[PDB]
Amino acid sequence: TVTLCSPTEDDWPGMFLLAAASFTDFIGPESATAWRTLVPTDGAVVVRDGAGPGSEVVGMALYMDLRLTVPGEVVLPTAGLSFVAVAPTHRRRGLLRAMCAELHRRIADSGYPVAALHASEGGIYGRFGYGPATTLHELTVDRRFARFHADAPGSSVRLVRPTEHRGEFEAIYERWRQQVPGGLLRPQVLWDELLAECKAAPGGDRESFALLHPDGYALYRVDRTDLKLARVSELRAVTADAHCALWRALIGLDSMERISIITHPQDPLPHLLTDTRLARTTWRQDGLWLRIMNVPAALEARGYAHEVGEFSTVLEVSDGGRFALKIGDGRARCTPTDAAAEIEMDRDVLGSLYLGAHRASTLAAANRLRTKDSQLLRRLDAAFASDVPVQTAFEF
Amino acid sequence: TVTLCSPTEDDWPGMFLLAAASFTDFIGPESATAWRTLVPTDGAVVVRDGAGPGSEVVGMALYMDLRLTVPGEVVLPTAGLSFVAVAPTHRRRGLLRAMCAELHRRIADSGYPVAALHASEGGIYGRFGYGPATTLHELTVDRRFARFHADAPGSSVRLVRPTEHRGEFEAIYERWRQQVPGGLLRPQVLWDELLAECKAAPGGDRESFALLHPDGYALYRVDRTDLKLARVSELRAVTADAHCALWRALIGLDSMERISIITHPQDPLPHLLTDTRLARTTWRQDGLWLRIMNVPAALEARGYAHEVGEFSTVLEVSDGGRFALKIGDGRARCTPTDAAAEIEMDRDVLGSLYLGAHRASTLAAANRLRTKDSQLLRRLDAAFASDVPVQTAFEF
């Protein structure tokens, strides 16, 4: 019958086929071979139908070696799940469950404190311990009315061809990803992939341009259907000045009516303008999802807010251990215990708290996180918050 | 030419006329006479074109006596601006400016620490010192897919005719408004107006129904265009249990495809469901705007987060005074000083911070508030935050 194992190079065509059929956006077998370099030996699982040769791939899943920045500018080795897929012929046969269990086992044994993914659908991954941990926020600016506020900072920005300033983009992004929770190291192979997208595609996307600043850049292109809409695919700013200067340039695209960007909830853009409504939220969705693999390792690794007095509690993760958790001076100490729990939550809830994108008090109101103490709740809220708001580095 | 003065009863027809022409959703002379009882003697200003009787009103503005809840469950007398209108024939002649100046003078002399409004546009009121202080967040739930999470609490709620349960609605709302920043006291005259809207309007809105719980209620009606959409005009919940029970009932409206509600950003609804995407944000906008009239009175009045250690700074408001600000133990002391400023911001920025809806660090990134100290920023951030997320009580 069905069997779970690590793919051979023989299994690839089957996997590419399943991938082509599962993901519209499938980047070709070629492009899939850049991401492959991020897959460790043993980072992939397939389900074959039958035993023997000529068995076909009906399930696949893999993880990539990533580096995720978490609050306090700490970088965690992170296992990024990707290309997860079950054949349309084998739904509801337990394949996803078996493949995820096997991959989590490998991820845990390998020593990753956290796993992560982007969710094709919202009701799938909670059951596997993943919680949404960043929030994608689309802003659409009607630039026809947009005027900058007297207080806004600001000729330092240049309009450039992306493919001619790779080094400058890499250096800026690299600084960006080390300072911001949600940041991911972007390897050379992914910079190759990204820069190849910049050329105009006949029957596809119009060519991309870049706005470059010593401390930030934006990549944008005119929408293919709506020609009065500019789409900002990526904007990395490491200083507030760079962020403002880049927006002055984008609002300077007089040929356009609207500029849109997928950004984060605390993007200060609306406050740069004299009319904050002009920056409309047109779309909101979960971004990066997190599964805490090792609770103590993860809790001790991140920084915590200093604006909270030292406190101690006992945290129980459903089927993930019980811990004495002490937080003070922006650090956590997290040790085994069997003392009565003061806070309980499923594993996924913890990943949702972990980068500061969700407040413990909000999850508590949903009974997703249970405690006796309201004071304890406010303290967790305050401790887990992030100085630097969490952003999403790139889908994978 | 033009003159600014307090209206007589002679001026009402002119004002009604100007009102009908300025506000589509105008409270007929009938309803306008309910809100009128909330207007204090001398709370109204008109601009007449010409002198002596026989002059038509070309400008009007007024304020109402309101009670606003701010963090720490503190209730402030608040002056609520409304029916502000300039005749389409007299735009750009300085009328709004003159009317706001005169009203602000009256509001200050009368002893209001704060003024508030709902803004018909986003680029008008900042210049007068108002900052957006709450955020309206529309959620549209596709209830065909909505399943409650195993953890969600939950019988208890009843489907009732609104008009037969006024006493119960009043008591619940009254409890609600005293506990939540943004809460407003709703006077009898406004309950009269509200319950009169519940009846089906011929050629207008459909009949309203209510879901009632001991500790919360929801008012909803089928949308008049889209008959698979239920619109929740108001949902007041005092306990998390009530909030979840009401949503189980709403998700129970099987003849509906979608339920929508205007709510706040920290609404825990998305976390009650197994798929959080199902609660889609379909719209976001500034709600209540605040003008701090008296900086020291306002800063000392509200409670601050207990999680921040005591600290002291010097706050300068552009044309609003400089103050030594000391915050500790959830309390602020705020006294005159000429010591060098550590923080500066326009008056409107302070209004946006006041209820916890906007983070100081976000306004600083936009340069709307200047300091030279990042630690000071984190502390302001943490101190001004609210334990109970800020919500919007009713438009006025």
Whichever domain contains B372, its CATH number is: 3.30.1050.10
Domain match, B238 and B380 both: no
Domain match, B264 and B378 both: no
Search chain A and give the residue with CA nearest B318: A151
∠ at Cα B123 (B118, B128), nearest 5°? 70
Take residue A126 and report the two structure tokens written for it. Answer: 């909670």
Q: Report the CATH number that the domain containing residue B156 is assigned in CATH.
A: 3.40.630.30
Domain match, A12 and A101 both: yes
Domain match, A93 and A158 both: no
Domain match, B11 and B103 both: yes
A272 touching B, CB under 8 A? Answer: yes
Burial of B161 (0-12, 13-18, 19+ CB in 10 A): exposed
Take residue A345 and report the two structure tokens written for it. Answer: 């939550």
Domain match, B218 and B76 both: no
Residue of B138, B215, B244, B271 to mutate when probing chain A, most A C-beta within 10 A: B271
| B392 within a domain of the structure (yes/no) | no
How far, in Å, CA of A217 to CA of A235, rounded? 6
| B195 within a domain of the structure (yes/no) | yes
Q: Do A289 and A134 meet the contact criterion of CB atoms below 8 Å apart?
A: no
Q: Do B306 and B288 meet the contact criterion of CB atoms below 8 Å apart?
A: no
Q: Helix, strand, or coil here: B301? A: helix
Burial of B10 (0-12, 13-18, 19+ CB in 10 A): exposed
How far, in Å, CA of A325 to CA of A383, rounded? 12
Spell B92-129 as b/e; 16+ CB within 10 A means b: ebebbebbbebbbebbeeeebbbbbbbbeebebbbebb
Please indicate if the annotation marks A85 as binding a ligand: yes
Report CA-CA distances (Å) from B346 to A72, A274, B127, B129, B252: 31, 13, 10, 7, 48
How many Cβ pairs within 8 Å bridge chains A and B?
Answer: 130
Take residue B116 and report the two structure tokens written for it. Answer: 């508030």
Q: Do B7 and B15 meet the contact criterion of CB atoms below 8 Å apart?
A: yes
| Phi, psi values for residue B394, rounded to 5° | -80, 150
| B396 within a domain of the structure (yes/no) | no
How far, in Å, CA of A136 to CA of A119, rounded? 12
Q: Half-sphere exposure of B344 toward its Cβ, with a 13 Å CA cutoff? A: 9
| A394 within a domain of the structure (yes/no) | no
User: Domain boundary at A291, A306, A338, which?
Assistant: A291
**Chain Cα centroid distance, residue A21:** 24
Please indicate if the annotation marks A166 as binding a ligand: no
| B394 within a domain of the structure (yes/no) | no
Q: Helix, strand, or coil here: A54? A: coil
User: Domain boundary at A238, A266, A286, which?
Assistant: A286
Strands annotated E in chain A: 2-5, 44-49, 56-70, 74-86, 114-118, 131-132, 135-142, 158-160, 209-213, 216-222, 229-237, 258-263, 279-286, 288-292, 311-317, 321-328, 331-336, 343-345, 369-371
Take residue A72 and report the two structure tokens written for it. Answer: 């306090």
How far, in Å, CA of B144 to CA of B258, rounded? 8
Domain match, A109 and A147 both: no
Report CA-CA distances (Å) from A215 to A172, A250, B136, B177: 6, 16, 34, 46
Q: Which domain holds residue B200?
A: 134-286
Residues of chain B found within 8 Å of residue A240, distances taken between Cβ atoms: 364-367
| Phi, psi values for residue A40, rounded to 5° | -70, 155
Instruction: Write the DSSP string, A176-225.
Output: HHHHSTT-B---HHHHHHHHHTTS--TTSPPPPEEEEETTEEEEEEE-SS
The number of beta carbons lying within 10 Å of the beta carbon of residue B54 is 7
Of B346, B385, B389, B379, which Cα lies nearest the Cα of B131? Answer: B346
Amino acid at B113: P
Please indicate if the annotation marks A96 as binding a ligand: yes
Total number of domains constituting chain B: 3
Domain match, A233 and A299 both: no
Domain match, B127 and B46 both: yes
| B395 within a domain of the structure (yes/no) | no
| B157 within a domain of the structure (yes/no) | yes
Q: Helix, strand, or coil here: A85? A: strand
Contact A368 B281 (CB under 8 A): no
Q: Which residues pair with A292 in a beta bridge?
A: A114
Burial of B15 (0-12, 13-18, 19+ CB in 10 A): buried
Q: Helix, strand, or coil here: A294? A: coil
Contact B284 A280 (CB under 8 A): yes
Spell A126-150 as b/e; 16+ CB within 10 A means b: bebbbbbbbbbbebbbebeebeebe
Search chain A and give the residue with CA nearest B365: A240
Report CA-CA distances (Å) from B270 to A20, A81, A120, B155, B209: 32, 24, 17, 22, 24
Report CA-CA distances (Å) from B8 to A257, B37, B41, B62, B95: 47, 15, 11, 13, 19
Chain B 336-355, residues with CB within 8 Å of chain A CB atoms = 346
| Phi, psi values for residue B144, rounded to 5° | -60, -35
Q: Which residues pair with A160 in a beta bridge?
A: A210
Of B389, B137, B69, B312, which Cα lies nearest the Cα of A381? Answer: B389
**Cα pseudo-dihedral B381, B382, B388, B394, rounded to 10:** -20
Of B120, B140, B135, B391, which Cα lies nearest the Cα of B284? Answer: B135
User: Domain boundary at A229, A254, A286, which?
Assistant: A286
How far, in Å, CA of B2 to CA of B159, rounded? 55
Domain match, A278 and A159 both: yes
Chain A 7-26, residues with CB within 8 Å of chain B CB atoms = none
Take residue A257 and report the two structure tokens written for it. Answer: 């009516």
For residue B372, give every residue at least 6 positions away whose Cβ sits within 8 Å of its Cβ, in sequence order, or none. B342
**Chain Cα centroid distance, residue A392:** 5
Burial of A318 (0-12, 13-18, 19+ CB in 10 A): middle
Residue recorded with tokens 């495809």: B257
How far, in Å, CA of B264 to CA of B280, rounded? 13
Spell A329-357 as b/e; 16+ CB within 10 A means b: ebebebeeeeeebbbbbbbbbbbbbbbbb
Take residue A266 and report the two structure tokens written for it. Answer: 């605390």
Please indicate if the annotation marks A61 as binding a ligand: no
For residue B299, give every residue at least 6 positions away whose Cβ sits within 8 Å of its Cβ, in sequence order, or none. B323, B325, B332, B334
The number of beta carbons lying within 10 Å of the beta carbon of residue B390 is 25
Please indicate if the annotation marks B152 as binding a ligand: no
How far, in Å, CA of A296 to CA of A299, rounded? 5
- CA–CA min distance A226, chain B (Å): 21
Domain match, B117 and B7 both: yes
**Is A394 one of the annotated active-site residues of the chain?**
no
Q: Which residues pair with B81 in a beta bridge?
A: B63
Q: Helix, strand, or coil here: A112? A: coil
Query: Experimentally, how was this structure solved?
Result: X-ray
| Phi, psi values for residue B147, rounded to 5° | -120, 135
How far, in Å, CA of B353 to CA of B350, rounded? 5
How far, in Å, CA of A45 to CA of B387, rounded? 46
Search chain B and give the residue with CA nearest A368: B151
Contact B307 A307 (CB under 8 A): yes
How far, in Å, CA of A41 to CA of B189, rounded? 72
Domain match, B143 and B280 both: yes
Residues of chain B found within 8 Å of residue A122, distances taken between Cβ atoms: 275-278
| A139 within a domain of the structure (yes/no) | yes
How far, in Å, CA of A177 to CA of A174, rounded? 5
Q: Helix, strand, or coil here: A140? A: strand
Of B345, B121, B366, which Cα lies nearest the Cα of A278? Answer: B121
∠ at Cα B243 (B242, B248), nearest 5°? 95
For residue A43, give every residue at least 6 positions away whose Cβ sits within 8 Å of its Cβ, in sequence order, or none. A62, A63, A64, A65, A79, A106
Contact B149 A366 (CB under 8 A): yes
